[PDB]
Chains A and B, each alone.
With several copies, the nearest count.
Chain A
């Protein structure tokens, strides 16, 4: 939720980004922000405008997509923890009001495009319309409960609890292309984790330790940098983008010096809103306790999974049976550890 952070780390700190392979993370416990993945499947997997839906009336495109993505997530050996969002905070209410206003404008343009008759405009304006309800996340948590793959309900935000599970070492990394995990404090962030045979995108792995080594900052100055160049929690100062926020952080550290020394006659602080509440909410959120979780990848239920997905979602039998067989093969293969648990990485050889 940081406007222009991945391009910034691609610009000024190239040593953080290691675009690795999806095969590379064998046996890595991984926390995953799941709600954006649910919108990725409910936006992407459509049969020509219509979402992939069944006889009873509900949609099952997210169930389809994350069953298939999680089976080839274990087929590369990545062990996921799909972390689900909870109650959003009162500081996120302005951005959620902006999202609701953009959804209302998309609804008005969809009502224009339905009378217009262009099919691509209707499918794009319903591709910017997707919003879940707790019934959708309950169906997904029923899938992950029958998966034998652990779900965790975050209290406030899923990426904050993902960053806490990386910080306690309960998982190796947080997997989302949302960039808030480096703000909330995660050392390793896994962008673009797509478990596909069409391996069009490498796994963009973001290291916070190389960011803090390269930029020479602690956690607090990086949180102030992300607040200055734009977050989904509080408004940024108008006129300061990525590079001048990097220079303003690097010339004096805290945001209090930034708001107390910079003149309002050129770059004014908008609305005189206090950024310190967003700072303390990035550092200390209502976060999940990482020592009280049960990160156990058990044996999957097969017959109850078939009964669920073909008694109230009416899927096809042989693809789920091949998926559960690949899941059983991966559960037999998942006891193999890495060499990184025994031999430490002492650099990376780069060719010319």
Chain B
């Protein structure tokens, strides 16, 4: 009864390459208001909240609430069969345990039917109070990939600090100390390469860098990263998926 024609087929490929190494098994909680995915880590440290609304899908036909368990390594190697320009249709039925994926291509005449067996899993559902966070930044995603990828060579801990000049990333380890300071943008008026800081108070928390390396696998999804955190809440790494969905990554402080 479930059908979801996603026309810009790089989106689900980027979601499965983002969540392949982090989550091994989860539950794609699919409702009539849009596909959701709220899951904890396999190592049980990081919370992943994925939500895509129905307006981005070209033909989203969802009769009722589907809560089925999808293996993410299986679905990631199924989305590795898809091209970067095709149309992904998620035909499904609740009678059999089949998650059928059909890949219509625009360039070619390819029809790639891919039915996947699904395992029964306990659906985790942990809420988040939607609060106004302390330091909410809007900084480039390639910059966050670069910063986490280079600070992970020093150690497994980053001290992300916000200030009036901007965000400061500080990692300490055996090779030494690495401080990365990102300032504002004065008069470029770009607002995708530009870094904007929304802050009420300066904070200083220590975050693990292996989970940030897992979080920076979502960098082709968006050109912006919305890191929003406070002094006690987990860091929220939000990737705006094509203005039609969001992928939120939660990380407890170290």
User: Which residues on A are within 8 Å of B, measured CB to CB?
Assistant: 18, 21, 23-27, 77, 332-333, 335-352
Is A77 within 8 A of B252, CB to CB? no
Give bound CA distance, A339 to B119, whole Å: 26
Tell me which of B13-21, B41-49, B73-81 binds A: B41-49
Is A343 within 8 A of B45, CB to CB? no
Is A339 within 8 A of B67, CB to CB? no
Give bound CA distance, A340 to B41, whole Å: 12
| Residue B128 lies at the interface, judged by CB distance under 8 Å to chain A | yes
Is B125 within 8 A of A346, CB to CB? yes
Contact with A along B17-48 (1 / 0, CB 8 A): 00000000001010000000010101111110
State the interface size on chain B (CB cutoff 8 A).
36
| Residue B118 lies at the interface, judged by CB distance under 8 Å to chain A | yes
Give bound CA distance, A333 to B252, whole Å: 13
**Complex contacts, A338 vs chain B, CB 8 Å:** 44-45, 252
Is A343 within 8 A of B121, CB to CB? no
Is B124 within 8 A of A343, CB to CB? no
Give bound CA distance, A336 to B126, whole Å: 19
Main secondary structure of the interface of A (DSSP, over half): loop
Is A351 within 8 A of B121, CB to CB? yes
| Residue B145 lies at the interface, judged by CB distance under 8 Å to chain A | no
A113: min CB distance to chain B, Å: 45
Give bound CA distance, A350 to B252, whole Å: 24
Is A351 within 8 A of B67, CB to CB? yes
Is A26 within 8 A of B43, CB to CB? yes
Is A352 within 8 A of B252, CB to CB? no
Is A349 within 8 A of B124, CB to CB? yes
| Residue B154 lies at the interface, judged by CB distance under 8 Å to chain A | no
Is B27 within 8 A of A351, CB to CB? yes
Closest to A20 in B: B122
B181: min CB distance to chain A, Å: 23
**Complex contacts, A25 vs chain B, CB 8 Å:** 44
Residues A343 and B126 in contact in the complex (CB < 8 Å), given A23-B43, A338-B252, A349-B67: yes
Chain A-chain B contacts (Cβ-Cβ < 8 Å), number:
93
B13: min CB distance to chain A, Å: 23
A16: min CB distance to chain B, Å: 13
User: What are 13 sample pairs from A and B whose C-beta atoms fall under 8 A apart?
Assistant: A24-B44, A77-B43, A342-B234, A343-B234, A348-B124, A349-B27, A349-B29, A349-B38, A349-B123, A351-B27, A351-B67, A352-B68, A352-B96
A175: min CB distance to chain B, Å: 17
| Residue B199 lies at the interface, judged by CB distance under 8 Å to chain A | no
Is A343 within 8 A of B125, CB to CB? no
Within 8 Å by CB of A336, from B119, B120, B208, B233, lies: B208
**Complex contacts, A333 vs chain B, CB 8 Å:** 156, 208
Nearest first, the 6 closest Cβ-Cβ pairs linking A and B are A346-B127, A351-B69, A26-B43, A23-B42, A348-B124, A335-B254
| Residue B220 lies at the interface, judged by CB distance under 8 Å to chain A | no
Is A348 within 8 A of B43, CB to CB? no
Contact with A along B218-239 (1 / 0, CB 8 A): 0000000000000011100000
Given A332-B156, A347-B125, 6 other A-B contacts at CB below 8 A? A23-B44, A338-B44, A342-B232, A343-B47, A349-B67, A352-B96
Is B125 within 8 A of A339, CB to CB? no
Contact with A along B107-133 (1 / 0, CB 8 A): 000000000001111111111100000
**Complex contacts, A350 vs chain B, CB 8 Å:** 67, 120-123
With most chain B CB atoms within 10 A of its CB, the pick from A77, A338, A339 is A339
**Complex contacts, B120 vs chain A, CB 8 Å:** 350-352
Is A340 within 8 A of B118, CB to CB? no
A141: min CB distance to chain B, Å: 30
Residues A341 and B124 in contact in the complex (CB < 8 Å), given A26-B43, A351-B68: no
Give bound CA distance, A338 to B127, whole Å: 15
Is B45 within 8 A of A336, CB to CB? yes
**Complex contacts, B156 vs chain A, CB 8 Å:** 332-333
B136: min CB distance to chain A, Å: 18
**Complex contacts, B66 vs chain A, CB 8 Å:** 352
Is B254 within 8 A of A337, CB to CB? yes
Residues A339 and B27 in contact in the complex (CB < 8 Å), given A347-B125, A351-B120, A351-B121: no
Is A337 within 8 A of B253, CB to CB? yes
Give bound CA distance, A115 to B121, whole Å: 53
| Residue B2 lies at the interface, judged by CB distance under 8 Å to chain A | no
**Complex contacts, B123 vs chain A, CB 8 Å:** 348-350
Residues A339 and B42 in contact in the complex (CB < 8 Å), given A345-B126, A348-B122: no
B172: min CB distance to chain A, Å: 11
Give bound CA distance, A351 to B68, whole Å: 5
**Complex contacts, A347 vs chain B, CB 8 Å:** 124-125
Is B44 within 8 A of A339, CB to CB? yes
| Residue B57 lies at the interface, judged by CB distance under 8 Å to chain A | no
**Complex contacts, B38 vs chain A, CB 8 Å:** 349
Residues A24 and B67 in contact in the complex (CB < 8 Å), given A346-B126, A348-B124: no
Give bound CA distance, A335 to B206, whole Å: 10
